[PDB]
From a paper:
The structures show a zig-zag arrangement of nucleosomes, with nucleosomes 1 and 3 forming a stack.
H1 is absent from the stacked nucleosomes of the 4×177 array, but is present on nucleosome 1 in the 4×187 and 4×197 arrays, and is present on both stacked nucleosomes in the 4×207 array. Our structures show that H1 is always bound near the nucleosome dyad. H1 that is bound to nucleosome 1 always contacts entering linker DNA via its helix α3, whereas H1 on nucleosome 3 uses α3 to contact exiting linker DNA. When Δβ was close to zero for both linker DNAs emerging from a nucleosome, H1 binding was observed.
Author numbering:
A (entry chain Q), G (entry chain M): 10 to 118
B (entry chain K), I (entry chain O): 37 to 133
C (entry chain S): 35 to 109
D (entry chain L), H (entry chain P): 20 to 102
E (entry chain R), F (entry chain N): 30 to 124
DNA sequence: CATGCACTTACATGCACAGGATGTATATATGTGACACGTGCCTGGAGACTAGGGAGTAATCCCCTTGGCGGTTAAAACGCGGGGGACAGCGCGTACGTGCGTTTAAGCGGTGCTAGAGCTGTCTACGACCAATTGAGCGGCCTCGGCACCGGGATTCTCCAGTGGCCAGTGGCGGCC
DNA sequence: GGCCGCCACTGGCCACTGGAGAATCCCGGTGCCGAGGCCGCTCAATTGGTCGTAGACAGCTCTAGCACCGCTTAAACGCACGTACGCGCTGTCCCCCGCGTTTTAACCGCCAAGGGGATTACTCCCTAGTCTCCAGGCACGTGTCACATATATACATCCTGTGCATGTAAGTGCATG
């Protein structure tokens, strides 16, 4: 009578919810109609960027010898990638701190 | 003689410390008190989530810190190592306020 | 009127006698304390000190020209 | 209940701490009250926006959601508070 | 009794264990990620809506989203995101 | 003949004459005026859409726009705009 | 037996088109519904802003003894009002030039 | 057919005129080429977006409102050319 | 004897002139050449409405002029009157470019 | 008669003010086109009705916020030497403003011609919409190991007492006149 | 015999060095509470099918952009040359900083009140949508005076030549050694 339900995220094979993002765009007042591949494309690019920043966070935590990522790792990761840095130059992280950075003449001699 | 560090050495040490550190630098209670005080000026009997106060503290500290890196850029640009009131005035004007 | 600025300068350099020579700002404050309108006579003091340096009566310690420290001759 | 001089509640060593996190090596003595005024002007901007949001919500309880709305409206978006 | 609230924690958890099985996470870092995904989603959606208005197109397709991410995301991030989304929409098209 | 392109010339011309009967207008300053009015309209409309999104409201009322007038328009201009818009709202309420 | 076609801008005593702004808000995709008085309020606010900026422009043109509004007068008007300048700090003007501004140290003794 | 050097088309006297409009009375010689690089950087920053709008419009010819969209995207909103 | 103004006098005179004037300070056709050259680096055979080239123009000198008042305030902040590219780098970095 | 001092006199130098040049400011002339206004029109705003649903409002409760005491220090504050840094002054050597002749290329303007922006019939892909259903995603709970805290070494950096080298000051010696 | 130059000694200053002392990290051990993982629910994502319609395409057109070509003149360009400007040196005062001591209030911990955020229920006010209609503004067209440009004249300003006050140096007569 009816086939087993297969999710569109599974049909794409990506982890972000296609149906949730499509519902958000339907109720977010951006267009009267949305092409079917558009939220899939959105979920894909979101999962790519979250994946890469998670690589950066995991590398930062492993450099800090910590198993779990912290907002300081997020600060250190997001400020040392220039595309990400100017992507979020005006975006602020809770309890992130700052980069270790000292101007040259501040040092002695 | 008693030990005494030369000026700037402890300053550089605490620079390294607070750049390493992540915590808020101002006390929680007088900050919340001042936030309630100034918010009372617009409309009366306002209640505050503690999360809102902490988030405002975070944003204010970050905004101030970025203002001081701009001030540091101005001061090193002015060939000085001591920040000056005209440096903050300049940085505020360059940012567009 | 009174004496020219040269007696004022040599009195300023003979007043203190540190290991290093007296400086421009120190001698200006010395003549301000002794009594002279140093604010409009900066060029006058510069030319007087340079002329008296050329006489060999004063030797400039570290600076060049009118800057630096200034001290009296050997004898 | 009624308080007056809590701009002085941002104490001078706290401003020194912010400056050391800001990489300032030397601070003039005239700096602290100026920075107090600056953080003030900034704060009544953001809380005036927050109060406007809150009265628009028909609430007298200020939420951090309203705060992050106010900060991103000034182009100063903050992460980590439910946005 | 409570009300259900949306968050992106579990999908980011699958992504994290996909990229780093050995690495944990703090929950406030997840709050920062939730602000991240909501903010970037809102940016792309607003850009897509304004682009759809510019060409008077009442439907936003993956071409529009591609245009928007090319606008906002710079270069290397842009080209790899374009590649990932292109592969995703292609394998969805085969599905 | 071509397609109609709506512009703001006649309305701004009328308000210009009622504030200054004596003076004239240049058309590229009028292009600036179209850009200005469209810009502020877009800003306030986007802010109102954001506010209704936050309060889960499907309907934009003048309360939302009035709030946005507090938000964007600075100070004394905002109190003035509340005054004129409020009395205009009451007049239209009286049909 | 229809009523005579009366206009909503006249109903609010306004010059800006209530119907056009209402149509733009309906098709601008900002919400699914809009209140009746909301475009009235919006048109009133826009009319007030345009009225004050045109008055400032006319005063500026009178100062430069020209009978027609020039965008130089628009630049002089916007940059000399503090709340307007705060509204339009990041706005680029066509043919505006700048304010006549010379720093004090740039002038000779 | 192709072009290789038009950055020198922004001549030193034109830059001097701009700095006089900027209120600069004295200009070092090192200024001009560095400012050429800065203005150039601004040019690809706007024109990459402009090309993106143009191709997304499926047009081969660049139109002005696309430039308007790109500039207000960069927070540099231009009046007098919309529509 | 042929007259010669002292330095800065003429410079301040065209400062007053160009602050008074609104007309465009850039030769139009070299600017158009540079626009087409840079545009060809992203897409070949691009064609331009002249109005688009104009809009790009006033956007360009608007950014450039505002940069120069920023750098001028930086330079007088540095107690100098001659601008140097370090001032421009300072202004770009403080603006977050 | 010589010599120091004071007095007088001449010359160098900085400051002030008049005078010309000149670029900008101020007065008509004009002819032009941008601007402003009359006109056809059609399409977009408005009038009447409807349907239905989103928002306004009552009730409640509970959870979150507010209000209050008391140790407990860390932090704030005060004070004080004292080094380091802002900053004034000057010299000075330059690089850039200013001026003027040249070349060039920017601009005007005029023709040709075409890609291509853009407008309009068509029809179909596609996407929103409605009924069902479920399983994945979220509330709840538990527990446990990553992680916070602490205490003892090891390290590490840094400042300060000696440490020798260098340079100039200084006295003594030998030769010379 | 005294004077002068030379030579050798010596003291102070400046870069080098080892060690001490305090800060900082690191390693090991301990508890402790958020991560996260499992369990139960539910609601919303999916499936399927339909209707309508959005937009891609075909095709055409006319228009604005691109090219070119000649003329012209102002702008750029480049060289000369003076001057003012960065800026490095020196120094000098004084301003925060490190290092303590006192103080104080922040914070944590705990406890009680209640208030309004939020949630559900009910309702009806309002507004999107549809049909009809007509007039408001827009494209088009066309006259017309505001002003851009041109020309003549006035004044502000700016540099500069000259004239004055003042500081300084030199000569010399006179009183005296």
């Amino acid at each position: 009578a009816r086939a087993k339900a297969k999710t569109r995220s599974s049909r794409a094979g990506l982890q972000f919810p296609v149906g949730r993002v499509h519902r958000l765009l339907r109720k977010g007042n951006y267009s009267e109609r949305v092409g079917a591949g558009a939220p899939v494309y959105l979920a894909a690019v979101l999962e790519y960027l979250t994946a890469e920043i998670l690589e950066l966070a995991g590398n930062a935590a492993r450099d800090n010898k910590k198993t779990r990522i912290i907002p300081r790792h997020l600060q250190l990761a997001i400020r040392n990638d220039e595309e990400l840095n100017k992507l979020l130059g005006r975006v602020t992280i809770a309890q992130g701190g700052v980069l270790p950075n000292i101007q040259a003449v501040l040092l002695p001699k | 003689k008693p030990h005494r560090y030369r000026p700037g050495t402890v300053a550089l040490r605490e620079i390294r410390r607070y750049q390493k550190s992540t915590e808020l630098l101002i006390r929680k209670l007088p900050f919340q008190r001042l936030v309630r005080e100034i918010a009372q000026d617009f409309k009366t009997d306002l209640r505050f989530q503690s999360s809102a106060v902490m988030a405002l503290q975070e944003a204010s500290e970050a905004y101030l810190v970025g203002l001081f890196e701009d001030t540091n850029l101005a001061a090193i640009h002015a060939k000085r190592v001591t920040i000056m009131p005209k440096d903050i005035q300049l940085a505020r004007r360059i940012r567009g306020e | 009127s009174g004496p020219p600025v040269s007696e004022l300068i040599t009195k300023a350099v003979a007043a203190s006698k540190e290991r290093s020579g007296v400086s421009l700002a120190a001698l200006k404050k010395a003549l301000a304390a002794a009594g002279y309108d140093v604010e409009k006579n900066n060029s006058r003091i510069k030319l007087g000190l340079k002329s008296l340096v050329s006489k060999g009566t004063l030797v400039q310690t570290k600076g060049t020209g009118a800057s630096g420290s200034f001290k009296l001759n050997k004898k | 209940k009624v308080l007056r001089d809590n701009i002085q509640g941002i104490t001078k060593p706290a401003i020194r701490r912010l400056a050391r996190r800001g990489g300032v090596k030397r601070i003039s003595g005239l700096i602290y009250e100026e920075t107090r005024g600056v953080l003030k002007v900034f704060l009544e901007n953001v809380i005036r926006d927050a109060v406007t949001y809150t009265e628009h919500a028909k609430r007298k309880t200020v939420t951090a959601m309203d705060v992050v709305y106010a900060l991103k409206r000034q182009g100063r978006t903050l992460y980590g508070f439910g946005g | 009794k409570r009300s259900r609230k949306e968050s992106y924690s579990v999908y980011v958890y699958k992504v994290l264990k996909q990229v780093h099985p050995d690495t944990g996470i703090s929950s406030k870092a997840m709050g920062i990620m939730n602000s991240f995904v909501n903010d970037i989603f809102e940016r792309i959606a607003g850009e897509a809506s304004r682009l759809a208005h510019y060409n008077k197109r009442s439907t936003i397709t993956s071409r529009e989203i591609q245009t928007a991410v090319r606008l906002l995301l710079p270069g290397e991030l842009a080209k790899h995101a374009v590649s990932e989304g292109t592969k995703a929409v292609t394998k969805y098209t085969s599905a």
